[PDB]
Design a protein around this ligand. Structure first.
Ligand code: NBB
Ligand code: NBB
Ligand code: NBB
Lengths: 119, 119
């Protein structure tokens, strides 16, 4: 959604997007809501983000985030901004994997709301 | 730093200034360069401006400026000048939130460099 998101990621996520929305009952609208700062703690959306992250090997089975690869995949300017934010917001914490991702998403968005994007 | 900036603003912003400088690793020098017409597109300064704006609800999570909140903060002397420059420079456009504010800052500084103040 933010205008910085690399064109390539739209194609790259297309397979897992579909699998992850189906697995979690996600709708397009929930996704669109996020860019606008309207993230809700609902499994259809929070587990969807976990699902997408796992598909890119960015989380393990306990929603521990691979910070190095996550940051490495971001464009230059986002990477700089994310380094600080992710130092704060990582390691993840929460009651389950989906909540861990929600907490992370919310933590990032407090300071860098354009940095945590969902598609 | 321009002489028109209300005294009160220096105190109004002091809390959010410190937080924003700490969050973005901004130096006082970078802030002082801005009045001097030296703004560089560097997150340490561009995201600091975003941070301060957001802190007073002058921008949203997509770095779209609220024109009315902007004018509200501005003194009477500047209402007329500010409106004209905002007319030409708004809406914000750019890759990420920090670039949006950099682009706005450059646009304003092109005709009204003393309107874009940073503290
Ligand atoms: C296909 C290679 C580009 C990936 N870059 S990204 O900004 O979309 C990104 C996606 C997910 C996590 C971090 C960064
Ligand atoms: C900066 C990290 C953004 C991660 N957001 S996302 O989990 O919905 C996601 C988006 C795209 C690919 C994988 C995960
Ligand atoms: C035209 C308005 C200037 C905005 N500049 S500033 O982002 O450093 C900022 C200064 C003071 C309060 C809020 C933001």
């Amino acid at each position: 959604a933010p205008d910085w998101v690399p064109p390539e990621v739209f194609d790259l996520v297309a397979e897992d997007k579909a699998r992850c929305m189906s697995e979690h009952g996600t709708t397009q609208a929930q996704i669109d809501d996020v860019a606008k700062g309207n993230l809700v703690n609902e499994p259809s959306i929070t587990c969807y983000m976990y699902c997408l992250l796992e598909a890119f090997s960015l989380v393990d089975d306990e929603a521990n985030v691979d910070e190095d690869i996550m940051l490495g995949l971001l464009p230059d300017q986002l990477q700089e901004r994310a380094q600080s934010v992710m130092g704060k917001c990582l390691p993840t914490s929460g009651s389950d994997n989906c909540n861990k991702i929600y907490n992370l998403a919310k933590c990032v968005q407090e300071s860098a709301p354009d940095v945590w994007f969902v598609i």
